[PDB]
Amino acid sequence: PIETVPVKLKPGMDGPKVKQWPLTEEKIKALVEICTEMEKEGKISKIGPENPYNTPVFAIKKKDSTKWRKLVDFRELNKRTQDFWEVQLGIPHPAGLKKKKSVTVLDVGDAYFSVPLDEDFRKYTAFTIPSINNETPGIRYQYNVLPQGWKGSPAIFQSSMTKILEPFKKQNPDIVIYQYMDDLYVGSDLEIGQHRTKIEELRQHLLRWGLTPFLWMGYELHPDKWTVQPIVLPEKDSWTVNDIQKLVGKLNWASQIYPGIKVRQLSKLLRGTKALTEVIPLTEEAELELAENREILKEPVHGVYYDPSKDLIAEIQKQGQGQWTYQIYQEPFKNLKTGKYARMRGAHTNDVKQLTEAVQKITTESIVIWGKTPKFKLPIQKETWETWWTEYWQATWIPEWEFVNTPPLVKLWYQ
Amino acid sequence: PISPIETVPVKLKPGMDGPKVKQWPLTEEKIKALVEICTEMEKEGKISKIGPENPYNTPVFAIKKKDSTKWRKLVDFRELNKRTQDFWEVQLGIPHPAGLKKKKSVTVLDVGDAYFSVPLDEDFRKYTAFTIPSINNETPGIRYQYNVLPQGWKGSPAIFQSSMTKILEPFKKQNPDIVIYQYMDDLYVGSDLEIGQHRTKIEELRQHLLRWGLTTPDKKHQKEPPFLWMGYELHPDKWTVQPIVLPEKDSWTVNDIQKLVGKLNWASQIYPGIKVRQLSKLLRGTKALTEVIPLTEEAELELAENREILKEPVHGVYYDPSKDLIAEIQKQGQGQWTYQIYQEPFKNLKTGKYARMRGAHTNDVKQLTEAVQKITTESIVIWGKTPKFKLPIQKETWETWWTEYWQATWIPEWEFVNTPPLVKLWYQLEKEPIVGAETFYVDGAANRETKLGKAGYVTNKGRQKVVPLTNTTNQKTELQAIYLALQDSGLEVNIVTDSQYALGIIQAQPDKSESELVNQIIEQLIKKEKVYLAWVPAHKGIGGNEQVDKLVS
């Protein structure tokens, strides 16, 4: 007896049509089981070819979880769905969440299944289960309820959600709670045990509505401890021609970010034609120029701030030795954050696993800080990525990405 | 009395209306055989005759069934197809024999007259209307509308196929001891049941289908092996392809080579070692399908080697889930690779090739990686898992490649197999400048309008060169200047360029290129003991970079 929030698409846009990609045996086995059970309970229903629309589906295991979890890639539907900001259904983002000492991430997406979905919008949720060696043609379903991974779901459910958390919030006013897609981010300044306690409280509090993948899991962050990786100029006593050439290259590039940077005096040291390995002393003029440049790199870039209306973009560079650098930005050369990752899972064995972890870490950070996922520029071949990435994906959301090949002529973000 | 097959709702695209195309003129033999058929359709209830309230029409025609006395009826619905709603196709891929497990008992049957056994959507029937000339248009002629899925309609395959699937669904579920492969109307059925119990189950399947109005004519019912399925022949312990016909024709059109390469690809799935490179190269060009092509000396050797492989019959085996999958790859040269997938030695599940050349400049390691990726995906399609790989590349070679390369890259669990030719890196650039090696500051430039340019260098020992160049570009001169430095330097050299373009190419360690100049540079790089490449910004008055910039500008 619950009425449905009507939903439209952006005008001038059809629904998603995206081919299902091949799935491993274990993932298909898991999907058939889950989709069979979901069909019993009315959450999904079979459909035919007369529905033109399709969305890819696969399955994942969250970190340190042994049970499969259905994951639909709604990225195409989400972009084509009406922005719920215009409908006022948008979820505001707390600035203080990144300030908390601990933030736990709960998967609440299970709740959304309780809410029916607008009948006319259901056709857009269509997906297709494949089979090994194409024994059967694809078996199509669509959603009768709010699907996990759809941007509309947390919005339409927000009403109910605020109500359920009302007592907990008021009992614990110093705790920050933010909702993004299927996840709940809960911050506090408490001691860890106290924090973990209050998280368990919030869970039982959720069962009280429950009675009236699974919720038990949680993941701890410490955003207060997050660091940045600025641009740095090496310190040397003696400089070769090569060193100074690299420095000039690096500085000349950096000047796109910090305009006050000057290579004139250092470039002069390069005046002759010399062996790369020759040691040359800095002139009196060049030493200050370097020093004056170093200070400019200490201070922050001017007129760089977050614009809520602009998309976030993330770039990643492979630095070797399991080291990875990244920059988050809206407009080029104005970076909102810079960072470095090292010794992640797959370090010194698997590049793709490491990059997958990097992408998940960066998205997580972006969600906490700006309440947004960036579009990624990935340093890898399309086919390489597309082959292995679903094997390592532990997250309930999928960010946007594109593929780039960029030789590091200057080692800019790492030395 | 049949259980009726529920109709599939179908619509035209919004604000679009049914087709009116009328008819093109027909030859009498065609118009004649046509009208006899329309009558049979009317009788059996596949079609209804009332035409007067219907503004719509679409052409019809006829052509003979292959090497048969019989005339076939076809409707050209292309205009309706445009105006009809899009469908989502449920056929995602083709089943492959190497994915079948071994079965004691096997049957292959087809459903008779598939499309015409499925009722069309009541409201959509009117748009299917068509007009036959009575006798050469002398008199008005017969008008009809389809009561079932017509041939030529884009929605027919998806709709039949889906209906076919819904009928089978209860039967599969209540007989888990059976395996059914439905491709469209074509069925493969297999079991470990005793043939009697199996002959029984088949007939139940046959009645179940008849109950919904789907016949399975005895003519299309395969009982005894070899079973002809999906273009293959299925024996009990082994499978193979149906025989391949190679044109031996001594005068080759464009179209001849196309057909030839086409069948070779098809053969490659089982017959190991097939190479289409030189044959395909005969085909690259503007030539029209009729132009006759002389076979090159290599292409004739390629075609020759192919025949030698095909002379012998080959069989694949079936799949044993208990055992791991093994994928083994070999380099065939010229960017050609073949592989074998197997569980036990010398018994191939299947084989294949990867010849694809992507990118202007590449190397064997990139290509091997790509081959690994295609094989991984193909394997996941057929067996739903990734095979363990055996590759002609040393662990250190691979380790040096992927750790130093600036793009993320990986290969799943694999082991080195020593099977020349081995994949290796042909040169490695120094990470640091070389002490005591001559430093070449290189540069090149071209005039946009004249297409004339210069390439040159100056070194720290006073050595200098400038060379004039015609019909060139900035990018070419930049590579040229690096080529000169490599030619004019000893076994160890430092090279300083401002060219992002040139360094981008060379730092990826290409062993092969579509560019002759790049190949020449590669040839020099292989001869060197040590090379250090370095980039500096232009127009900063750097190094010999200022000095050589003036020389060539």
Place this chain on the structure above:
DNA sequence: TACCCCCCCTTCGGTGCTTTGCACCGAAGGGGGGG
């Protein structure tokens, strides 16, 4: 003078940095195969 699916090889135009040339990539039309 028709319809739906998959594959390889080539060609060709769009797209974005290597920049006004060059490299990449997807679409489409040739061929093979299936119904």
